From a paper:
Peptides are named systematically appending the one-letter code for the amino acids at the a and d sites to “CC-Type2-“; e.g., CC-Hept becomes CC-Type2-LI.
Finally, we tested the importance of β-branched residues at d in maintaining open-barrels outside of our designs. A recent design of a parallel pentameric α-helical barrel 5H2L_2.125 has a single Ile residue at d. The peptide formed a stable 4-helix assembly in solution but crystallised as a mixed parallel/antiparallel CC pentamer, which is another low-symmetry structure. Thus, the single β-branched residues at d appears critical for specifying the open, all-parallel, α-helical barrel of 5H2L_2.125. This is demonstrated with the 5H2L_2.1-I9L mutant that lacks β-branched residues at the a and d positions. The sequence crystallises as an antiparallel pentameric barrel instead of forming a collapsed structure.
Numbering used by the authors:
A (entry chain E), B (entry chain A), C (entry chain B), D (entry chain C), E (entry chain D): 1 to 33
Amino acid sequence: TQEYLLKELMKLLKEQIKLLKEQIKMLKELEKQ
Amino acid sequence: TQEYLLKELMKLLKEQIKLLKEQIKMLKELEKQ
Amino acid sequence: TQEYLLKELMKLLKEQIKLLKEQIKMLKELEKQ
Amino acid sequence: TQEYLLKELMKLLKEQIKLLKEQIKMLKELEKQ
Amino acid sequence: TQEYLLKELMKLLKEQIKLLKEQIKMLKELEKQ
């Protein structure tokens, strides 16, 4: 059961990475202004 | 109490994801002007 | 305004710091087990 | 070891807090402009 | 100045992503145990 929960935590951290990359793309749009 | 502690980390990581999505909404508004 | 949206981003980052501190406390308890 | 991995995770979260504090500082500098 | 600050925010988010990748490495070894 502990191993199953550790796999869930890794999935949630990967989602944080995806959203941070979306923020970087938005910061580049702002940099053109 | 390891399963309890891992479930509490799951909830905190989900809350982090929610905050990142709220930040993206604000960056989009900033880009519009 | 620009000022309004930057201040809201600051509040959301401060909330992320609060949650990271709670995550550290959960890891500290796991380490003892 | 389990102890090594949990102690290193705690150190990485503390480094994340330091980055968030610097992100807040950059937003405050943007606000002044 | 505004462009310099936006580029610094991009660098800080890239540093966050690197820390999150390192956290995933540690959770991966804990899951194998």
